Design an enzyme around this catalytic site. Structure first.
Site, PDB file in Angstrom:
ATOM      1  CB  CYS A 155      -0.981   0.034   0.966  1.00 31.66           C
ATOM      2  SG  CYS A 155      -2.178  -1.605   1.243  1.00 31.66           S
ATOM      3  CG  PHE A 206      -7.224  -5.676   0.476  1.00 28.66           C
ATOM      4  CD1 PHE A 206      -6.662  -4.572   0.766  1.00 28.66           C
ATOM      5  CD2 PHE A 206      -6.784  -6.835   0.690  1.00 28.66           C
ATOM      6  CE1 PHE A 206      -5.711  -4.552   1.783  1.00 28.66           C
ATOM      7  CE2 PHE A 206      -5.492  -6.946   1.951  1.00 28.66           C
ATOM      8  CZ  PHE A 206      -5.178  -5.805   2.327  1.00 28.66           C
ATOM      9  CG  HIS A 294      -3.258   3.740   1.382  1.00 22.57           C
ATOM     10  ND1 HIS A 294      -3.571   3.230   0.125  1.00 22.57           N
ATOM     11  CD2 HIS A 294      -3.132   2.876   2.112  1.00 22.57           C
ATOM     12  CE1 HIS A 294      -4.096   2.213   0.027  1.00 22.57           C
ATOM     13  NE2 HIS A 294      -3.582   1.820   1.708  1.00 22.57           N
ATOM     14  CG  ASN A 327      -6.508  -0.776   1.055  1.00 19.02           C
ATOM     15  OD1 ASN A 327      -5.871  -0.253   0.236  1.00 19.02           O
ATOM     16  ND2 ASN A 327      -6.136  -1.239   2.306  1.00 19.02           N
TER      17      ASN A 327
END
Lengths: 380, 380
Positions: A155, A206, A294, A327
């Site tokens: 990430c 995810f 992020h 994500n």
């Protein structure tokens, strides 16, 4: 030797996601059905609670009921499944990046023959030749394109690609760097287990997506449109964070372990990590800066916002990306940057960074590594 | 912003290899014994012929009879074996790189705290955090070290790390880049098969080794000792070479396929690939240049030598590395550079590049990608 004068500048941003939309509200229904875990009613309640509190509303996935039915080992917890995961990932990662790249090249307005460098990042499978070669081949870039292939960096890779592009763009006259981050959840897809809460967190967080950008120093006037300038790039391994985020590519796929202290480690050290780029620009107020953080999870965003005393609107672009796509690992922070400039163009704001001058692109991942870039917006 | 003036310069080279030496003459005896293929007498004759013609005299391996006995799946052709291969590779790759790095830092003479960047390359397994983090941790480098982790880039990676280090060193004042290439044959180890000649070629060629170097622009006088300057760096995907060198990380480990036309593809295009750096320095005679060519195999070295009309001594350093350590993938070309400077210091030659001014660092691998760097030697 003539070197370019100006800082590495983002000249275009293009994004892509697979067409299959999965609502987070009903994701547990789909998830427990394809993994044949309908009988694990208690685990489903726990997973529903994680999905409802994930801050995610929808995610885009290449993986469907049909693809998972044709590859049954991916729906098994620890059975040998790396092979069908790779077969999917190796093909889909550069294909998704291609769509993002085409959109980036179109927005840039210049021919693809002018792309001298290619930086590619993915944690979604590994192959030789890499996803960088595969993207170059699909786009028909010059056979002499200088490539930097960043595999399994997690990430923080969205920030790493820009850090790499910074030096490639600033050290080579006329250099136009195609940056591409593409993530497909084929390798991380994990069947729910009563004994793997990290697996449930990842299954709820995810998502799939690709982001591509053109980076180059000394923009050509009336031809290229500068979006963001990169002024500082660096990273930091956080103190007392050994083994915080681990990821292993095994026979069963990409097995990850996230220690419960991850958002706390990030928030306790974020002010110190931002120390070097802040002194470079004489310590501007945190609320006078734009934030491309992020969206690892809601806890990471909530805790940084609270620790630094940020007003609620700062983390909005990051929260919006989390809400719409989840994500998407490396690609996420670049989707946030795109949303920041889109909001700025939509609202007719003074700068591309939501009216603010300086800003941060922050990525997090294995180490615990926090990658940070200081960006300057462009007046519009 | 103050940028450094001079080209990226190699300030030190350090190398390492595991202590277990395996003679190539008797390697088939050991190889067929540990893989329990003693009954495949015909395949042993074919493998003996490949080993006798490989141009390799000895190879250093982490893998021993004992380690392979404790991990029996690695000795099986297609059985699930990625897990024990990774367990070995993830730990041994940065450990071997540590020894090479310590030797490089010692030769450099400056403290490890001055290392600002770290470029690491390996095709020997993948992990999160990467081998770059693991090397940084083992050496105790600054927690803010800027890392570029190059996973699964094959045999051109020794050239890629220098291409990356070039831009990192030249674009950042005071930047000292630790470059590390480490390869351990844990993932590529393949049991002999009557139906996999590529497996026999790799089993006869691939060796273990690590190479590390310090790269930096603007050497500090009377403190640092310049060895080679990097003047041009680039690459080229060869025409009509699709699928020439393929490598897949599967449940059985790293499965590779090398099409028979690989050395021919390299030799037919080498003159054209070298066109751009040659015109940068006004086309010097090939025999007036030093050659740090990746020793992929004897055929690649023989055919480039014959095509370019090189005198037999040019490829000697490359052949010496092949003879002593085999094909250590990414690390090989850096061992060649080390041998070129060592021969130069031993023979009291005018330059570090065997008396020659300009030279090439050429790596080959998946694509088919040929990575080339133009180096200038330093007068001694």
């Amino acid at each position: 030797v003539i070197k370019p004068d100006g800082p590495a500048t983002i000249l275009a941003i293009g994004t892509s996601n697979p067409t299959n939309i999965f609502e987070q509200s009903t994701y547990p229904d789909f998830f427990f059905d394809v993994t044949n875990c309908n009988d694990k009613t208690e685990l489903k309640k726990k997973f529903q609670r994680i999905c409802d509190k994930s801050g995610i509303k929808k995610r885009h996935f290449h993986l469907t009921d049909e693809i998972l039915r044709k590859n049954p080992s991916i729906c098994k917890f620890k059975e040998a499944s790396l092979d069908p995961r790779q077969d999917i990932a190796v093909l889909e990662v550069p294909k998704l990046a291609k769509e993002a790249a085409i959109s980036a090249i179109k927005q840039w307005g210049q021919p693809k023959s002018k792309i001298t460098h290619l930086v590619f990042a993915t944690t979604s499978g590994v192959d030789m030749p890499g996803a960088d070669f595969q993207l170059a081949k699909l786009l028909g870039l010059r056979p002499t394109v200088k490539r930097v292939m960043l595999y399994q960096q997690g990430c923080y890779a969205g920030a790493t690609v820009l850090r790499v592009a910074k030096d490639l763009a600033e050290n080579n006259k006329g250099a136009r760097v195609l940056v591409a981050c593409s993530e497909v959840t084929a390798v991380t897809f994990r069947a729910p287990s009563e004994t793997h809460l990290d697996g449930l967190v990842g299954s709820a967080l995810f998502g799939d997506g690709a982001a591509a950008l053109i980076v180059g120093s000394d923009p050509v006037p009336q031809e290229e449109k500068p979006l963001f300038e990169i002024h500082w790039a660096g990273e930091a391994v956080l103190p007392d964070s050994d083994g915080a985020i681990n990821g292993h590519l095994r026979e069963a796929g990409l097995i990850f372990h996230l220690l419960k202290d991850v958002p706390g480690l990030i928030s306790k050290n974020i002010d110190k990590v931002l120390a070097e780029p802040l002194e470079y620009v004489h310590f501007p107020s945190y609320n006078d800066m734009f934030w491309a953080v992020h969206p690892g999870g809601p806890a990471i965003l909530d805790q940084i916002e609270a620790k630094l005393g940020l007003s609620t609107d700062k983390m909005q672009a990051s929260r919006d990306v989390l809400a719409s796509y989840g994500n998407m690992s490396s690609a996420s922070v670049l989707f946030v940057l795109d949303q920041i400039r889109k909001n700025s163009e939509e609202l007719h704001l003074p700068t591309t960074g939501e009216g603010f001058e300086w800003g941060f692109v922050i990525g997090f991942g294995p180490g615990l590594t926090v990658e940070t870039l200081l960006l300057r917006s462009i007046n519009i």
